């Protein structure tokens, strides 16, 4: 915990709108309690290839 | 493959049976290796039903 004290940590930043990606999906995360339901636009993740499945061996 | 460029034959060496692998025909750089599993035709489509080569005519 001592080093955790030393290491400065950047606080979280909220999402911002994208003009070039106005067509992105938006999800409205429901609140089960009295709190209002909150929505935020989605962001497409990276596209990567795939390697066929195999098992470790020597 | 059903007509692979390489085959499989058990050999017998120094008191221990092993299986040697040899190419049926002349091979050049970069060719992928194939060999016949010698399974039943029902098992062939059951396991190795892909061959990737049609007839030319």
């Amino acid at each position: 915990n001592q080093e955790w004290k030393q290491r400065r940590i950047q606080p979280v930043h909220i999402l911002t709108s994208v003009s070039s990606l106005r067509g992105t999906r938006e999800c409205s995360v429901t609140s089960d309690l009295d709190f209002p339901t909150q929505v935020i636009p989605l962001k497409t993740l990276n596209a990567v290839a795939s390697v066929p499945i195999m098992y470790s061996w020597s | 493959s059903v007509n692979p460029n390489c085959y499989a034959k058990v050999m017998m060496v120094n008191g221990d049976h092993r299986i040697g692998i040899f190419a049926k025909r002349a091979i050049q750089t970069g060719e992928e290796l194939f060999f016949d599993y010698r399974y039943s035709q029902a098992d062939a489509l059951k396991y190795v039903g892909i061959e990737r080569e049609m007839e030319i005519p």
């Binding site: 990606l21 106005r22 992105t24 497409t44 596209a47 795939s50 | 990737r52 080569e53």
Partner: protein
């Protein structure tokens, strides 16, 4: 092989070789084209092969004779340079349509940089 046929002699079926294109860039291109269509109307008014130019007068010019000339300007602002036309040409060139092949050389980069990107982008080397 003297009997070699066309290029289609590979297989009857194969697993997918994976696509090189990405979905996220498609949305960016779509919205880039959406705003591009809002100012050029290629897909709507030009039928995908033409662009409409809405005329606008910057200055009015009068000669010693009855020759009254107007310097035309057009809405997209990536247009051909302003030209002088007479008042008789007004209300006639209000909506000018120009084919893609007739566009000037410089306007190619102005409408969309992605039409041709000079991949060096700088003098890293020759």
């Amino acid at each position: 092989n003297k009997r070699r046929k066309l290029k289609n002699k590979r297989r009857r079926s194969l697993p997918r070789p994976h696509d090189f294109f990405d979905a996220q860039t498609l949305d960016a291109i779509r919205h880039r084209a959406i705003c591009f269509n809002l100012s050029a109307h290629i897909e709507s008014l030009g039928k995908g092969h033409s662009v409409v130019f809405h005329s606008t007068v910057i200055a009015k010019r009068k000669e010693d004779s009855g020759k009254i000339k107007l310097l035309l300007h057009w809405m997209p602002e990536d247009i051909l340079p302003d030209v002088w036309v007479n008042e008789s040409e007004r209300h006639q060139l209000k909506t000018k349509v120009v084919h893609l092949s007739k566009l000037p050389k410089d306007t190619a980069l102005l409408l969309d940089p992605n039409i041709y990107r000079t991949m060096p982008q700088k003098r890293l080397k020759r």
